[PDB]
Design a protein around this ligand. Sequence first.
Ligand SMILES: Cc1cn([C@H]2C[C@H](OP(=O)(O)O)[C@@H](COP(=O)(O)O)O2)c(=O)[nH]c1=O
Length: 149
Amino acid sequence: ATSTKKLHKEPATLIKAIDGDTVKLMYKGQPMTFRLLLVDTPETKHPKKGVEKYGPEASAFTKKMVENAKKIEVEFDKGQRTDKYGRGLAYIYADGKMVNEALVRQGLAKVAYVYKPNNTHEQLLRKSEAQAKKEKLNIWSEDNADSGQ
Ligand SMILES: Cc1cn([C@H]2C[C@H](OP(=O)(O)O)[C@@H](COP(=O)(O)O)O2)c(=O)[nH]c1=O
Protein backbone atom coordinates (compact mmCIF):
# COMPACT_ATOMS: atom_id res chain seq x y z
CA ALA A 1 0.00 0.00 0.00
CA THR A 2 2.71 2.52 0.96
CA SER A 3 6.06 2.87 -0.84
CA THR A 4 8.70 0.80 0.99
CA LYS A 5 12.43 0.82 0.18
CA LYS A 6 15.64 -0.27 1.94
CA LEU A 7 18.12 1.87 3.91
CA HIS A 8 18.17 5.59 3.01
CA LYS A 9 18.96 6.31 -0.66
CA GLU A 10 20.11 9.86 -1.48
CA PRO A 11 20.82 11.48 -4.88
CA ALA A 12 24.32 12.60 -5.89
CA THR A 13 26.18 14.26 -8.80
CA LEU A 14 28.72 12.74 -11.21
CA ILE A 15 31.78 15.00 -10.84
CA LYS A 16 34.60 12.77 -12.13
CA ALA A 17 34.98 8.99 -11.76
CA ILE A 18 38.57 7.96 -10.94
CA ASP A 19 38.78 4.14 -10.88
CA GLY A 20 36.18 1.35 -11.20
CA ASP A 21 35.50 1.23 -7.44
CA THR A 22 36.11 4.95 -6.82
CA VAL A 23 34.23 8.00 -8.15
CA LYS A 24 33.95 11.62 -6.98
CA LEU A 25 30.30 12.74 -6.71
CA MET A 26 28.53 15.77 -5.20
CA TYR A 27 26.44 15.42 -2.03
CA LYS A 28 24.33 18.28 -0.62
CA GLY A 29 26.99 20.62 -2.04
CA GLN A 30 29.92 18.43 -0.94
CA PRO A 31 32.25 16.87 -3.55
CA MET A 32 33.72 13.75 -1.91
CA THR A 33 35.30 10.49 -3.15
CA PHE A 34 33.14 7.37 -2.72
CA ARG A 35 34.60 3.84 -2.92
CA LEU A 36 32.52 0.73 -3.72
CA LEU A 37 32.13 -1.30 -0.51
CA LEU A 38 32.90 -5.05 -0.30
CA VAL A 39 34.88 -4.89 -3.57
CA ASP A 40 38.54 -4.60 -4.61
CA THR A 41 39.63 -4.17 -8.25
CA PRO A 42 42.98 -5.66 -9.33
CA GLU A 43 43.85 -2.54 -11.35
CA THR A 44 43.64 -0.24 -8.31
CA LYS A 45 47.18 -0.28 -6.90
CA HIS A 46 46.91 2.06 -3.90
CA PRO A 47 48.45 -0.31 -1.33
CA LYS A 48 51.52 -2.54 -1.79
CA LYS A 49 49.07 -5.15 -3.13
CA GLY A 50 49.44 -4.02 -6.76
CA VAL A 51 47.75 -5.66 -9.77
CA GLU A 52 48.06 -9.47 -9.60
CA LYS A 53 48.04 -10.02 -13.38
CA TYR A 54 44.58 -9.12 -14.71
CA GLY A 55 44.72 -5.29 -14.64
CA PRO A 56 41.60 -4.76 -16.78
CA GLU A 57 39.85 -1.47 -17.63
CA ALA A 58 37.54 -1.18 -14.60
CA SER A 59 37.88 2.62 -14.61
CA ALA A 60 36.33 2.55 -18.10
CA PHE A 61 33.52 0.30 -16.82
CA THR A 62 32.35 2.82 -14.21
CA LYS A 63 33.26 5.54 -16.73
CA LYS A 64 30.50 4.92 -19.29
CA MET A 65 28.40 3.40 -16.47
CA VAL A 66 27.80 6.52 -14.36
CA GLU A 67 28.25 8.67 -17.49
CA ASN A 68 25.11 7.08 -18.98
CA ALA A 69 23.47 6.59 -15.57
CA LYS A 70 20.35 8.80 -15.80
CA LYS A 71 20.43 8.94 -11.99
CA ILE A 72 23.36 8.32 -9.62
CA GLU A 73 22.42 7.45 -6.03
CA VAL A 74 24.40 6.47 -2.91
CA GLU A 75 23.35 4.27 0.04
CA PHE A 76 25.37 4.59 3.27
CA ASP A 77 25.38 1.38 5.36
CA LYS A 78 24.69 1.18 9.11
CA GLY A 79 28.39 0.86 10.01
CA GLN A 80 30.71 3.89 9.85
CA ARG A 81 30.11 6.58 7.19
CA THR A 82 33.73 7.01 6.04
CA ASP A 83 37.07 5.16 6.26
CA LYS A 84 40.32 6.18 7.99
CA TYR A 85 41.00 8.29 4.88
CA GLY A 86 37.66 10.14 5.11
CA ARG A 87 36.40 8.41 1.94
CA GLY A 88 32.60 8.01 1.81
CA LEU A 89 31.48 4.36 1.85
CA ALA A 90 28.09 3.56 0.28
CA TYR A 91 26.66 1.21 -2.37
CA ILE A 92 26.21 3.30 -5.54
CA TYR A 93 23.29 2.64 -7.92
CA ALA A 94 22.30 3.80 -11.42
CA ASP A 95 18.95 3.44 -13.22
CA GLY A 96 18.12 0.89 -10.49
CA LYS A 97 21.33 -1.15 -10.89
CA MET A 98 23.88 -1.89 -8.15
CA VAL A 99 27.24 -0.68 -9.51
CA ASN A 100 28.99 -2.96 -6.98
CA GLU A 101 27.20 -6.07 -8.30
CA ALA A 102 27.75 -4.71 -11.83
CA LEU A 103 31.56 -4.97 -11.82
CA VAL A 104 31.40 -8.22 -9.81
CA ARG A 105 28.82 -9.46 -12.34
CA GLN A 106 31.27 -8.90 -15.21
CA GLY A 107 34.07 -10.65 -13.29
CA LEU A 108 36.19 -7.49 -12.93
CA ALA A 109 36.30 -6.69 -9.19
CA LYS A 110 36.83 -9.34 -6.49
CA VAL A 111 34.67 -9.26 -3.34
CA ALA A 112 36.66 -8.32 -0.21
CA TYR A 113 37.02 -5.75 2.60
CA VAL A 114 34.42 -7.12 5.04
CA TYR A 115 34.19 -5.32 8.40
CA LYS A 116 30.78 -5.63 10.10
CA PRO A 117 28.47 -4.11 10.51
CA ASN A 118 29.38 -2.74 7.05
CA ASN A 119 28.25 -5.65 4.86
CA THR A 120 24.43 -5.45 4.69
CA HIS A 121 24.73 -6.67 1.08
CA GLU A 122 27.26 -9.46 1.74
CA GLN A 123 25.02 -12.31 0.52
CA LEU A 124 23.77 -10.42 -2.56
CA LEU A 125 27.30 -9.45 -3.65
CA ARG A 126 28.69 -12.93 -2.92
CA LYS A 127 25.88 -14.29 -5.12
CA SER A 128 26.89 -12.23 -8.17
CA GLU A 129 30.47 -13.35 -7.43
CA ALA A 130 29.46 -17.02 -7.73
CA GLN A 131 27.83 -16.35 -11.11
CA ALA A 132 30.92 -14.52 -12.40
CA LYS A 133 33.03 -17.49 -11.23
CA LYS A 134 31.02 -20.15 -13.10
CA GLU A 135 30.89 -17.90 -16.19
CA LYS A 136 34.68 -17.51 -15.98
CA LEU A 137 34.64 -13.86 -17.12
CA ASN A 138 38.08 -12.18 -17.13
CA ILE A 139 39.77 -12.79 -13.73
CA TRP A 140 37.77 -16.04 -13.68
CA SER A 141 39.63 -17.36 -16.74
CA GLU A 142 41.17 -20.24 -14.75
CA ASP A 143 40.93 -23.87 -15.93
CA ASN A 144 38.18 -25.20 -13.63
CA ALA A 145 38.21 -28.83 -14.84
CA ASP A 146 38.72 -31.16 -11.86
CA SER A 147 37.21 -28.68 -9.37
CA GLY A 148 37.53 -29.30 -5.60
CA GLN A 149 36.64 -27.48 -2.36
C1 LIG B 1 36.47 -0.76 2.54
C2 LIG B 1 37.32 -0.89 3.80
C3 LIG B 1 38.60 -0.48 3.78
N1 LIG B 1 39.39 -0.58 4.89
C4 LIG B 1 40.79 -0.12 4.86
C5 LIG B 1 41.76 -1.23 4.44
C6 LIG B 1 42.66 -0.43 3.49
O1 LIG B 1 43.75 0.16 4.20
P1 LIG B 1 44.98 0.82 3.39
O2 LIG B 1 44.59 2.21 3.03
O3 LIG B 1 46.16 0.82 4.29
O4 LIG B 1 45.22 0.00 2.19
C7 LIG B 1 41.82 0.71 2.94
C8 LIG B 1 41.25 0.27 1.59
O5 LIG B 1 40.27 1.21 1.15
P2 LIG B 1 40.04 1.48 -0.42
O6 LIG B 1 39.42 0.27 -1.01
O7 LIG B 1 39.15 2.65 -0.56
O8 LIG B 1 41.36 1.75 -1.03
O9 LIG B 1 40.79 0.93 3.90
C9 LIG B 1 38.92 -1.10 6.08
O10 LIG B 1 39.62 -1.20 7.08
N2 LIG B 1 37.60 -1.51 6.07
C10 LIG B 1 36.73 -1.45 4.99
O11 LIG B 1 35.57 -1.84 5.10
